[PDB]
Design a protein around this ligand. Structure first.
Ligand SMILES: O=C(O)C(=O)Nc1sc2c(c1C(=O)O)CCNC2
Ligand SMILES: [Cl-]
Ligand SMILES: [Cl-]
Ligand SMILES: [Cl-]
Ligand SMILES: [Cl-]
Length: 279
């Protein structure tokens, strides 16, 4: 059914039109805090900001601001934190957010450098013996091991709250092969990656929401959460073809602006959901 709706859109070549309808219908809510002068250097892209109502608030006695949004999908009973790739001055805030929100997993969908340009700070240690200390938020981050596969890498990170000496294991799920232009021709690798994140337990309700990011935290990040939520809805509903991907994306856009950044990303999400539903 959705597979037939996909074919109809492909035949009529109307992906651009449907995507623009989503942009026109998208929620608009204030982003006052993100736009305060003191937060100028906490935002990677001036045109991508968290809404006030859903932004993640830092708990320590400093500026509470981070460019991060809580997406809470009520029917699917799943939550995500979507955030930008951290800046050199916000890596401490990023790990403070992971700690305070009790996240177990971080999903990274970009490379630190892409097409020769820097899209994200090097916010985790590449070498076991060169741990990272975030003196502003009093956290220590250590690479314990990594499992490098051909299209993604899973890292075992140890995050220590230097104030309490408590430690936690954070799983770093890094999709390293998103193409330089456009979307993956096939959703096979992306779905395998999603299933690996699921199997880890990082998306379960037992701990805090997974933290998902790309460079701006809206395009690739939006594809990941949209596909995941739509697949959940298809398992839950009596008539799984009743899942309206466009409605689900508009619901998610109540929580963060600009989720899905191109018509190709929209088509890719449809294709991922169609293929993943088959399993
Ligand atoms: O990596 C991503 O998918 C992502 O959300 N990218 C985005 S969204 C977005 C930009 C970018 C960028 O990477 O330059 C530039 C400014 N406008 C919005
Ligand atoms: Cl200010
Ligand atoms: Cl990288
Ligand atoms: Cl950077
Ligand atoms: Cl948009």
């Amino acid at each position: 059914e959705m597979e037939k709706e996909f074919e109809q859109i492909d035949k009529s070549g109307s992906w651009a039109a449907i995507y623009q309808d989503i942009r026109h219908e998208a929620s608009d809510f204030p982003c006052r805090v993100a736009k305060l002068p003191k937060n100028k250097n906490r935002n990677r892209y001036r045109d991508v900001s968290p809404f006030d109502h859903s932004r993640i608030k830092l708990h320590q006695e400093d500026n509470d601001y981070i460019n991060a949004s809580l997406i809470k999908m009520e029917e699917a009973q799943r939550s995500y934190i979507l955030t930008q790739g951290p800046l050199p001055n916000t890596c401490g805030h990023f790990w403070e957010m992971v700690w305070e929100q009790k996240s177990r997993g971080v999903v990274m969908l970009n490379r630190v450098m892409e097409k020769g340009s820097l899209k994200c700070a090097q916010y985790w240690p590449q070498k076991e013996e060169k741990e990272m200390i975030f003196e502003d938020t009093n956290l220590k981050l250590t690479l314990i091991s990594e499992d490098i596969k051909s299209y993604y890498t899973v890292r075992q990170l140890e995050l220590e709250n230097l104030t309490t000496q408590e430690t936690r294991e954070i799983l770093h799920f890094h999709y390293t092969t998103w193409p330089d232009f456009g979307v993956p021709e096939s959703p096979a690798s992306f779905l395998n990656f999603l299933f690996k994140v699921r199997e880890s337990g990082s998306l379960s309700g037992e701990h805090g929401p997974v933290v998902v990011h790309c460079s701006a935290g809206i395009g690739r990040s939006g594809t990941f959460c949209l596909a995941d939520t739509c697949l959940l809805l298809m398992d839950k509903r009596k008539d799984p073809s009743s899942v309206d991907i466009k409605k689900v994306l508009l619901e998610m856009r109540k929580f963060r602006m600009g989720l899905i950044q191109t018509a190709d990303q929209l088509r890719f999400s449809y294709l991922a959901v169609i293929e993943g539903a088959k399993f």
